[PDB]
Structures are given as C-alpha cells and as structure tokens.
RNA sequence: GGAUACUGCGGGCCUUGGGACCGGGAGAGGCCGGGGGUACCCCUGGGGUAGGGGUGAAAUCCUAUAAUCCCAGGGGGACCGCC
C-alpha cells in the first residue's frame, strides 16, 4: 500500500539537512547532514554532499517502508537571511532519482511582520 | 503772513487684505481605552542520534546530564512586513 511522508529541507550558506519524517511530522524516520559525509567545513553547503545526505536518507526511508514525499524546504530567516542556499534543488533532484515519489512542494520559511533588530549593527560587517 | 498735494491728528464711509460661520469631503496630525498578527527567546513532554554553529580559512563556543532538527503545549518582552 502507498505510505507517504515528509521531507523537511533546511539550507544555509553553511550546511544543509535532509529530514524525513512521517506526515505528522512527529515520527522521525531518516535525518543526515552535510557534515556526515565530508570532513572539511567548507564543503558541507556543497550541493553534492547535499544529494549524497539525500541519497542515504531516501534509502533508509525506502526500506523502512515510505514510498512517497511531500517536501518542506526552508532557509534560515527570522531574522537571518530568508533566501535558501544552492543545495535544496541538488537535494530534491537526489530524492526523486532515489526512487521515492514526490508531491507537494512548498517553501516553509518564517518572515516576521515585523521583527527583533538583526545583529550586525548600525552600519554592519566590513572586513 | 500765505498754501494744502503728501505724512501726522480728529470724525464718517467701503470691501479687495485679514478674521468668524455653514456645507460635503481628504489625511501615518495628537491623546486615551479595547482587541489582535506573525516572528524571536525560555520552560515542560513525545521522536531521533552524532555532530551543530561560525569563517576568506579557522578556532573559542553548544553538545551523550542527548545538542542541531521535527511535533504538542505553557510563559515573556519589543515591534507592526508586503500593499
């Protein structure tokens, strides 16, 4: 029988999470980071350990039982940046070759209306 | 001693400048009261297991007393996106 869950997608500019859950999203079945499957800091945004953590994941969800996926993708935001970071698209083109199904796409990240004062300062970072 | 155009002084008149009033409308003008909207931080439970964060690159830092992440709830302070 056709079992469905979710896949909740966090990218940054520094890392990226794949996480599988059930549609309550109270269960959770398979969760990889990009920081499992390189060993240097500067590569864990990197769209290919993104579709690799993907890769895994789909596989331990496949044999636990889940054939299909809606998808959550979200940046950071608040007041952090709210554009997503380039390893979402690589993650979901993995989960669709690993062989799951995939639904609804939707982008879940929060936006204030209106927000706490961001951290850089008056006049922010300047190197 | 003479004159009366201009200024001044005294008395009347006028409505153009200014003030008052009526009407139907515009506006983030100000004060008081009431009701909310997301987002953020902490606490309490359920799940899951080894990294998370951050940088030009790193390290201090948090994390097996179970973090990052997802779910259900309770509390708090400031501000009010797009249009």
């Given at each position: 029988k056709e079992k469905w869950?979710?896949?909740?997608?966090?990218?940054?500019?520094?890392?990226?999470?794949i996480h599988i859950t059930d549609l309550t999203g109270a269960e959770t079945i398979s969760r990889w980071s990009?920081?499992?499957?390189?060993?240097?800091?500067?590569?864990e945004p990197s769209?290919?350990?993104?579709?690799?953590?993907?890769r895994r994941a789909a596989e331990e969800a496949m044999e636990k039982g889940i054939t299909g996926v809606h998808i959550k993708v979200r940046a950071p935001g608040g007041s952090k940046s709210k554009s997503?970071?380039?390893?979402?698209?690589?993650?979901?083109?993995?989960?669709?070759r690993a062989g799951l199904?995939?639904?609804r796409?939707?982008?879940?990240?929060?936006?204030?209306?209106?927000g706490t004062r961001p951290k850089?300062?008056?006049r922010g970072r300047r190197v």
């Open positions: 869950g979710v896949a909740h997608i966090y990218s940054s500019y520094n890392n990226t999470i990009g920081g499992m499957v390189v060993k240097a800091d500067r590569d769209p290919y350990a993104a579709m690799i953590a993907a997503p970071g380039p390893g979402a698209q690589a993650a979901i083109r993995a989960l669709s199904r995939i639904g796409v939707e982008d879940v990240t929060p936006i204030p209306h209106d850089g300062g008056r």
